[PDB]
Structure formats: structure tokens, C-alpha cells
Scaffold this motif. Structure first.
Motif, PDB file in Angstrom:
ATOM      1  N   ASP A 166       0.747  -1.320   0.100  1.00 15.25           N
ATOM      2  CA  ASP A 166      -0.007   0.125   0.083  1.00 15.25           C
ATOM      3  C   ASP A 166       0.776   1.258  -0.110  1.00 15.25           C
ATOM      4  O   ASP A 166       0.533   2.348  -0.631  1.00 15.25           O
ATOM      5  N   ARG A 169       1.951   1.886  -3.595  1.00 16.95           N
ATOM      6  CA  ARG A 169       0.956   2.484  -4.329  1.00 16.95           C
ATOM      7  C   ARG A 169       0.695   3.769  -4.004  1.00 16.95           C
ATOM      8  O   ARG A 169       0.713   4.859  -4.922  1.00 16.95           O
ATOM      9  N   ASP A 170       0.892   4.307  -2.749  1.00 15.29           N
ATOM     10  CA  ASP A 170       0.782   5.541  -2.398  1.00 15.29           C
ATOM     11  C   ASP A 170       1.643   6.491  -2.724  1.00 15.29           C
ATOM     12  O   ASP A 170       1.580   7.720  -3.256  1.00 15.29           O
ATOM     13  N   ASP A 172       3.320   6.184  -5.793  1.00 17.27           N
ATOM     14  CA  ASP A 172       2.931   6.056  -7.108  1.00 17.27           C
ATOM     15  C   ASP A 172       2.026   7.179  -7.289  1.00 17.27           C
ATOM     16  O   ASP A 172       2.021   8.169  -8.178  1.00 17.27           O
ATOM     17  N   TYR A 173       0.773   7.076  -6.606  1.00 16.09           N
ATOM     18  CA  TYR A 173      -0.328   7.987  -6.663  1.00 16.09           C
ATOM     19  C   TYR A 173      -0.119   9.454  -6.195  1.00 16.09           C
ATOM     20  O   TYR A 173      -0.625  10.379  -7.145  1.00 16.09           O
ATOM     21  N   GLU A 176       1.852  11.112  -9.218  1.00 14.76           N
ATOM     22  CA  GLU A 176       0.967  11.058 -10.549  1.00 14.76           C
ATOM     23  C   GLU A 176       0.163  12.333 -10.395  1.00 14.76           C
ATOM     24  O   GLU A 176       0.060  12.944 -11.339  1.00 14.76           O
ATOM     25  N   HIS A 177      -0.479  12.382  -9.099  1.00 12.86           N
ATOM     26  CA  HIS A 177      -1.539  13.472  -9.051  1.00 12.86           C
ATOM     27  C   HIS A 177      -0.773  14.879  -8.434  1.00 12.86           C
ATOM     28  O   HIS A 177      -1.743  15.706  -8.421  1.00 12.86           O
ATOM     29  N   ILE A 182       4.188   9.854 -14.331  1.00 11.87           N
ATOM     30  CA  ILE A 182       5.124   8.773 -14.356  1.00 11.87           C
ATOM     31  C   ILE A 182       4.792   7.904 -15.488  1.00 11.87           C
ATOM     32  O   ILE A 182       3.542   7.535 -15.979  1.00 11.87           O
ATOM     33  N   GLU A 183       5.873   7.074 -16.242  1.00  9.30           N
ATOM     34  CA  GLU A 183       5.501   6.108 -17.153  1.00  9.30           C
ATOM     35  C   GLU A 183       5.298   4.897 -16.496  1.00  9.30           C
ATOM     36  O   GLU A 183       4.766   3.977 -17.180  1.00  9.30           O
ATOM     37  N   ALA A 184       6.146   4.331 -15.710  1.00  5.82           N
ATOM     38  CA  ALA A 184       5.995   3.188 -15.055  1.00  5.82           C
ATOM     39  C   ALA A 184       6.895   2.866 -13.711  1.00  5.82           C
ATOM     40  O   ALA A 184       7.398   3.928 -13.533  1.00  5.82           O
ATOM     41  N   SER A 185       6.527   1.826 -12.973  1.00  9.36           N
ATOM     42  CA  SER A 185       7.442   1.703 -12.046  1.00  9.36           C
ATOM     43  C   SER A 185       7.485   0.163 -11.535  1.00  9.36           C
ATOM     44  O   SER A 185       6.595  -0.564 -11.969  1.00  9.36           O
TER      45      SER A 185
END
Lengths: 443, 442, 233
Positions: A166, A169-170, A172-173, A176-177, A182-185
Motif C-alpha cells: 500500500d 502504491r501511495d 506512485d499515486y 502522478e496526481h 510517471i511512465e512506469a514503476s
């Protein structure tokens, strides 16, 4: 919507309850610097600039000009991805001026802007996509950073699958926002290691974003109970972390590294750009790989390169050329680690490449063999040189280099080399626990 | 049903899907993934996605390492958890080399070729897999253990404590991503469980076996437990297998069924069995992939350590359940959950197909207890063993032309070099059992 | 035999432990029982020949040939427990490759520089868990049949055998000792040479007990397996 004027910024502060503004800059060595401005002070800051102590950038080492002015740049205003009970927080950047109204040459961001101006004098602009590897560790019972693993996965494993799933994911999110795109991880080679791949982009905004990425990622992980480490080599015996820098030049939105009429579909000016990069990389390895621990990553056996070579096929050269063509033609430089100042480091890649294009620096043949498995004579016969083996060796290379001195400016050049000299002198005198393990019983 | 990239992008928008995860395996059956922001998905469907092929094939060699994933919209599936940030989904696709031909080192590509070959005869394969796992406790630091969650046995109603709710949530999560469980039950060992899934086309099933493992694991971790797919986590109790039931279909009808034979099995059913019996020794290295796999393949438990088929004996290596009709099936019992299911199911399919093409007789069924026979008794019967350890399974596979052609040379060689390194590491370890047996003695 | 329990008793009584395990610690040298041997006849060393350039008799060469022809067939005697084969791994003092030499000191069979009465052959594979009576009996029997049957030991191997390829070793015809106790048991199970030298009584009793030992070990789940696989699978 895009913030372009100070009124756009001041309107956005109102509408979204932004209560504190943080400046964002770096010192000579790449340490992330900041200070906090209440929203109530922000309009005045847009009007008169903000005075501050330049020792924050240039250190306390010398008696020099120290009262600087920050001229805020409204287009760099960006809301940070956490909402305190107190209110929203944003960052902003700017240009540092001396009291006489001339720009301060010692800001790393100005150093990059001068390389941008040089590329522009030749009709070019540079894009970069960095790849930030990092480690996700546990905090100990006191909340301190550790090297305790969060998983034991390997390359591209779908891992972790516990609570740390989690947190990842946090992170990454949040980026992005924030607007990173981001293109990828993926999970990287070592246990608990990760890589987030930035979108290709304008080099100034990219370097700005690499700095923002570092503390947003740390704050997210801390607040979830974890630690994000950008050390090049926190753990012996597993892979270190790098910052591979894909790059390309454009002439008004046409990729200058592409040429559809050649057998490789790479342009001549692409190869000259590589030739310039390979000609000078030894002289500024102390910039891309800036700490003692950088050279524990620059050892054989892992994702880290040690030998100066270029290649398409061989995914482990110093300079690697992906298969992509057309608009996305780029060259990847693999030696840098994430502890570096991205402004100083992208600037010297750009200056080196522009010299190769200007001087028609042929890069030589590509090395497609595994360079680790070769002998010295084969490497000598190939002329395959190696990067500096430790920080002292990197410093000396930089010391004798007028290319690096010209590109960085004398202020930055000398400030950088003195402080790095002092750090090595601190490191070298330490008696390490490994020495006692090996020698105490023996001697 | 997800059919088009337009179906997917609409469902991503409608259901607030913020992250997409790809889903593939490497040569050795490790599950691999990377995360695509939902903002990247339209570009991904249009241009493919470039990624490092060292994820699939490793780092040991200089070979083509820039691959392209072409996303397959009909494999889009929303995962059974809802983060605050937004929903999550998995997607699969086909891997391509920059020159535009398929990458042959992808285990999923190896399965499509077996599907494609079986279609030249008009045959299609269905699989209903039975997956056994152990539900273990975590320790104080959140890390796996082999500490039991119950002490129950075969088909018990157990656990009845908080782990009762974990097991239910796991069955619930899979059913409601569209797995269609047939049944689940407590298995022979303490804390051991099995989930039995409905029959499906072998490609959908192999994709779902990969999804299942990380879904089950993540669910268990998030309830405070650990789901383990080790073959033999614990000495002296049962291990975990992946029994693989399989049906072949032609013109809409079950190839294995014949209403007019005494046992109601078709002739091709026996030929299919003969092919599996002929080659199974040569890819035990694939169905039983790790060192620990051969601690499960020892006599005394549910594991079949002898090569034979039967309808009567439930413990034969190949079993025929009594079901006839469109559900006539063949259970191959030796695999364990650590195997790459794309490679296992393709090799079973090829081997069965080989048996049918060359009319390979399976011989007589073995209706007795093979363990309770002598070494000469079974040699009197001509009953062979499965390889006794990984090294032995490796040596059987390295000399197999059937296995080499079925996998392709790149997969065949990569797989063997990696497993050979894993064995060369394990054989030098000095285990604590050796100290207990020898330190005082010698 | 007296040596092992005198050393153990002395050590115990002073607060220490003497260990004859073939390999008690991973990654450091295992422990061998190197066996120097010489044959004599009418008070003279059968292995010594002044008139040859190397000063080794033709009977010395036959004796090495017999040892090489048969060492695989009774490695399970010279190296009798599971832990024997964790020392018989590459990287340390222990041989794993069936060769002979003087110049190479790693060899399975080495001939020291000594000449005259002290001329000897050194067998390096045994460890101190073996039964010295059985191990020496089969040493002497194997060398005696080399002399009886004029077994030519082939060329000595002077290079580092580890640094070769299985093609290089297959070119030279350099075979490997059994890699584990099961492989050694199988190799001994089929040797008529070992059965006749040891007798049916010992031969069968020894093999049944070693197989039982192997079957117990092969089924155990080791911590190494839990470290490697439990988090992964």
C-alpha cells in the motif's frame, strides 16, 4: 490549469486554502534546501523578491557575498500531495540575484540554465528522462531509518504484497496526481529495491522535478512508517541504486538523434554527442557519483557500470542506446547515482555532448562483449578505460579539468572540490570494524 | 466482457481504476509485474509498452533485452481490493522483439504454440486445477513463519477461529473476480487447504493460476496471515501439490469419452495417457521445479512417486475419475504449485498429443499399492520412479529432445542453467541435521 | 582407532572438543585422512627404481592404475557419511576429480618428491570417518590388482582441473568422484571387486545401513530450504 502569472498563483492559493509556501533549491553538493513562507507573505514576495542567506547554497567556508534575493518564478508553483489539517502546502522555485542585480553564478540551477543557453545558441533543446532507483526500508522502534528489508523480491517481482504494497502504491499515486506523469514503476534487482521512471521532458523542469521527487517520496514513506533511501549502496552484496539519464536533443521539436536514412537510424550528430560524453565523463564522475558510498556501487558484479564504453546491444555499457527510434530516440547514461545534484550533472552531460557535436568527436567503435570477463591487455588493446575507483580519484580528475571548470564556473568548481576533499579526508582516517575483524586476531 | 481497448478504457473510467498492473512470469515461474498509471493506458494500447526482457530471461547472457508488450484488452481484470487512491486491475499481453516477431522465451508464448499445434488436429484443451496451500502465521515483525493456524485434517471444518474468516475471504475474493470456485476443503496436513476451480480453456486457466497466487498471498498478508505455496514446508506432514485435471475436445465433444467401451473411455484417452507416461520423467524438472519439490516426492503421503496410471487407485501418478460424458478428465497428480503453469500445461498437452499422434499404448493400469511392493516386485511390473531429486530431474531433462523442441532452445537452455546453479548451491550446504547426526559421533 | 578416542578423551577432559566430521563448517576446509602408502618386497621399496628418469618403478605405475580403476567403486567406504560429500565439493583441499600427478599437489593421487625407501603414493580423498581397516584393505586390493593386471594409469594431470570445461575434462577423460552418498552407494552396489575384497557379509551389511542412512537424510526439510523458498513461493 497552468500557472503563468503571479495572479494565477495568488488566485490558486485562495481557491485551495494553501497556507504555506516552500522554496525549493539545492546547495553546491546537491542537498535539498528550503524555507517556509506563510501564504500571507506571498504577494509581497512576488513584488520585492525575498532576501536570504547565500551561505545556504555556498556554505559558510569563505567570506563572500551572502545576502541574496530570490525572484520567485510563478510557473514553478506546484501543490504538494498531502493535506495537513492546517491547510494545503505548495513548493515554488526562483532565480537568485546578488545585491547589485546580477544573477548569482553559484546556484546549480543557473549553471544548468547556462548550458541551456549554450544549446540554444546552437539551436537545440535537451530532454531528459531520469530513472530513480531507491530502497524501501523499515523504521526502527524509535522511528529512525534502518536497512531492514520490507521484502525479498527480485527484478520486476510483484512484491511486496503486505502493508508495504500500500505504501508503494501511495508513493506512485502522490507523484502522478502532483502532476509528475510517471511512465512506469517496478521492483528492482535487490531486495526491497524499486524504480520509478519519469516521463521524458524539458531538462529544466526535469531537474526541478527530481529534487521535488526526493522529499515527497521520503515524506510519504515516513508518514506511513517506512524509509525511502537514496543511498547509492546501502547494502553490500546486493545491487546499488543508480539514476540512469536518458537524453536527446531537439531542433524545434524534431529529434536530432534520429536519421531515417542511416543503417542504425541514428544521426551523425548523435554519435558526436556520445563522443563528447565519453571524452569528459571521467572529469566529472565526481559530480554524477558524488560521495564515498558512490564508489561502493561502482564495483563489478551488478547493474553498476565501471568501464567507459558505448553500445546498443549490451544492456550494461556506460552509454546504452535503446531500440526506440523516431521522436523517442535517446541515449542512456548509466553511471550516475541518485545522491547527485541533477542540475550540475545534467548540465555537464549537455555541455559535453554539445562539444562532441561542435568538434565532431568520433566516439569510436561500440563494445558489445562483456567487459568484466576480459583481460587487461584486451581492455588495453580495446583502449577500454575505467571510471575513477573512489572519490579521491574522481576529485583529482575533476581538479585538472578546464572543461568542467568552464562549464560549472569557478565559484561552483572550487566550492565543490574543497568540500569533497574534506569529506574524503574525514573518511580516509576512519578505522573500520572490518579492519578489526580481519586484523585484530592476526596482528 | 472485455473485448476491445474501448471496452477497457470505458470500464477504467467508470470504475475509477487508477493503476494497471501487467502480469507475466520468467523462465522459472516467478511472477513478474510493473505498474502503469491509468493515465498511461491509452498510450499503452496504441504503441505497446517497452520493457527490459531481462525480467523474463535473466541477466546471465548478452541477448536482445528491449521487448515490447502489446496489451491484450480481453485479459483486463479488476483485482479484489479497493485502495483509497482508486481501483487496481491486472492485464496481460504478448511480448515482441523490436524486429516485430514474437519473443519465444515468454512462457505464455510456449503455451500458445502448444495450443496452436493441438488445433492442427482440431483439439482444444481444458484444465481444472486443484491448488493446495498452507495458511501460516506471521511473526511479531510481520514476516512469514511455518507456525500453524489449526491442527485439523482431511475435509475438517477448521479453522473455527479468526482464520475461519481469512479462508472465507480468500474464497470470496477469488469467486468475485470471476474465478468460479467449484469447492474448497481442508486438506490432509494441519493448516493445509485446497481450492478446486472450474474447467476452462487452458490459456485462461494458466493466466488465472498466476493471478491466484499473488491474490491469495496479498489477501492473507492483509488479514495478518501468510499463504504459502511451498511443496514441503514441514517435514512429516503432507505437502502441497497442483493436481492438473485435463480434457480434450473436438467438434464440440469430449475426445476422451466413448459410450460404447466397457470403461466408457475413448481410445485417444489411453493414447493421451501413454504419451504422458512416456515423457513425464523428462519434464519432472518443470512440474517439480525446486529443491524442496523432491522433499514432497518421497513415499508416505499424497505425493505420487511412481509412474503408472489407474482408475481404481486414487494414489496412482495418473488417475481417471469416475466422471464420464462431457466431463471425462485425466488427473496428473505430481506437479506442485511452484511450477510455471504455462510450461507445465504446454508440456502435458504436447506429451498427450504425441501419444495420440503416435498411438502410444499406456499399458495396464496399476490397481494395487505400489509402496507395499518390493523393489523387485515393481521391477517385475516394470514400474519406474519419478526422479529422486532436482539434480536427477535436471539430468533427465537435459537429454530430452521432446522437452527441448516443446519449450524451444532459449527456454530449454535458460531453464536448465538456472536450475543447475540452484542445485550447485544447495549441494554444498552443511545442514543442522548433519551436526545432530555426526558431531558427537565422529 | 586408538588415536580417535585418545584425542577425544584428552580434549574433553581439558574443556574442548575434537571433531573428526568431514566438514563441520561451511565454506572453510573440510577434514581429510590422507593415506600415504608404500609396498615392500625383500626389504626394498617396490615403488622405487633408480634407473628410471622419474625414479618410479613400473610397479608403482601399475599400483596407481589399479587405484584409479576402482576408487569410484569404494568411495562410499573411504567417505562413508552424507557429510563426506559436503567436503567433496570444489574449492578447498579436497579432491573431487580422479587424476594422478607429482607436480600438482591437489591431485586425488599424488607422488611426493621422496625417493628411495620413503617413496610413497598419497591418496587424498578419504576422511577420518572412514573405517581404516576397510579403507586400507580396499586400497591394498586395488593397487594389487593394478600390479597383477598391469593396469596403465595413463598420463598425469599437471594443470588445475577446476579451471577446465566438461569438454576439456571429457577430452582428457577426467571423471568425477560420486557427488553424494547415494551415488557412491549405487557405484559400490554394482562392484564385484568391492564385494569379493570385503566379503558378502560386510558388503551387504554396509550397503543396507548406508541406504537406510541416505533415505533418512533425503526426506528431511532443511532450514536452507525455508530461508530460500518460504517467502518466495
Amino acid at each position: 490549469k497552468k500557472c503563468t502569472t503571479k495572479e494565477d498563483v495568488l488566485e490558486a492559493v485562495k481557491e485551495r486554502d494553501v497556507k504555506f509556501i516552500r522554496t525549493q533549491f539545492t546547495d553546491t553538493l546537491g542537498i535539498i534546501k528550503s524555507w517556509a513562507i506563510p501564504a500571507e507573505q506571498l504577494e509581497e514576495a512576488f513584488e520585492n523578491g525575498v532576501m536570504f542567506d547565500g551561505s545556504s547554497i555556498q556554505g559558510f567556508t569563505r567570506i563572500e557575498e551572502s545576502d541574496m534575493k530570490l525572484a520567485l518564478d510563478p510557473s514553478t508553483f506546484r501543490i504538494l500531495p498531502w493535506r495537513p489539517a492546517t491547510g494545503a502546502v505548495a513548493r515554488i522555485l526562483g532565480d537568485v540575484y546578488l545585491p547589485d542585480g546580477n544573477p548569482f553564478k553559484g546556484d546549480p540551477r543557473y549553471v544548468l540554465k547556462t548550458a541551456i543557453k549554450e544549446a540554444e545558441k546552437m539551436g537545440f533543446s535537451m530532454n531528459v528522462g531520469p530513472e530513480l532507483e531507491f530502497f524501501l526500508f523499515k523504521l526502527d522502534a524509535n522511528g529512525n531509518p534502518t536497512t531492514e528489508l520490507t521484502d525479498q523480491g527480485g527484478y520486476f517481482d510483484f512484491a511486496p504484497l503486505d502493508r508495504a504494497q500500500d505504501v508503494r502504491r501511495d508513493i506512485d499515486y502522490a507523484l502522478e496526481h502532483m502532476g509528475f506523469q510517471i511512465e512506469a514503476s517496478h521492483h528492482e534487482v535487490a531486495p526491497s529495491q524499486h524504480e520509478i521512471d519519469f516521463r521524458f521532458g524539458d531538462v529544466l523542469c526535469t531537474a526541478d522535478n527530481v529534487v521535488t521527487f526526493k522529499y515527497v517520496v521520503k515524506s510519504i514513506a515516513y508518514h506511513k512508517g517506512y524509509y525511502a533511501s537514496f543511498m547509492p549502496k546501502p547494502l553490500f552484496g546486493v545491487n546499488g541504486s543508480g539514476m540512469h539519464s536518458n537524453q536527446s536533443l531537439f531542433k524545434d521539436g524534431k529529434n536530432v538523434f534520429y536519421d531515417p536514412d542511416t543503417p542504425t537510424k541514428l544521426s551523425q550528430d548523435a554519435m558526436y554527442y556520445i563522443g563528447g560524453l565519453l571524452k569528459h565523463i571521467r572529469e566529472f564522475t565526481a559530480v554524477t557519483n558524488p560521495v564515498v558510498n558512490s564508489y561502493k556501487r561502482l564495483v563489478p558484479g551488478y547493474e553498476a557500470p565501471v568501464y567507459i564504453s558505448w553500445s546498443a546491444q549490451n544492456r550494461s555499457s556506460l552509454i546504452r542506446i535503446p531500440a526506440t527510434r523516431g521522436n523517442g530516440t535517446r541515449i542512456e547514461l548509466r553511471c550516475p547515482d541518485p545522491a547527485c545534484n541533477p542540475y550540475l550533472a545534467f548540465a555537464l552531460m549537455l555541455r559535453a555532448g554539445l562539444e562532441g557535436i561542435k568538434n565532431k568527436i568520433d566516439p569510436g567503435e561500440p563494445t558489445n562483449v562483456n567487459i568484466f570477463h576480459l583481460s587487461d591487455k584486451e581492455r588495453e588493446e580495446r583502449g577500454i578505460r575505467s571510471l575513477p575507483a573512489d572519490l579521491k580519484e574522481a576529485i583529482d580528475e575533476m581538479k585538472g579539468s578546464k572543461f568542467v571548470k568552464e562549464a560549472l564556473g569557478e565559484h561552483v568548481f572550487s566550492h565543490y572540490l574543497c568540500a569533497k576533499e574534506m569529506e574524503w579526508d574525514e573518511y580516509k582516517a576512519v578505522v573500520h570494524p572490518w579492519e578489526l575483524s580481519r586484523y585484530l586476531s592476526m596482528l
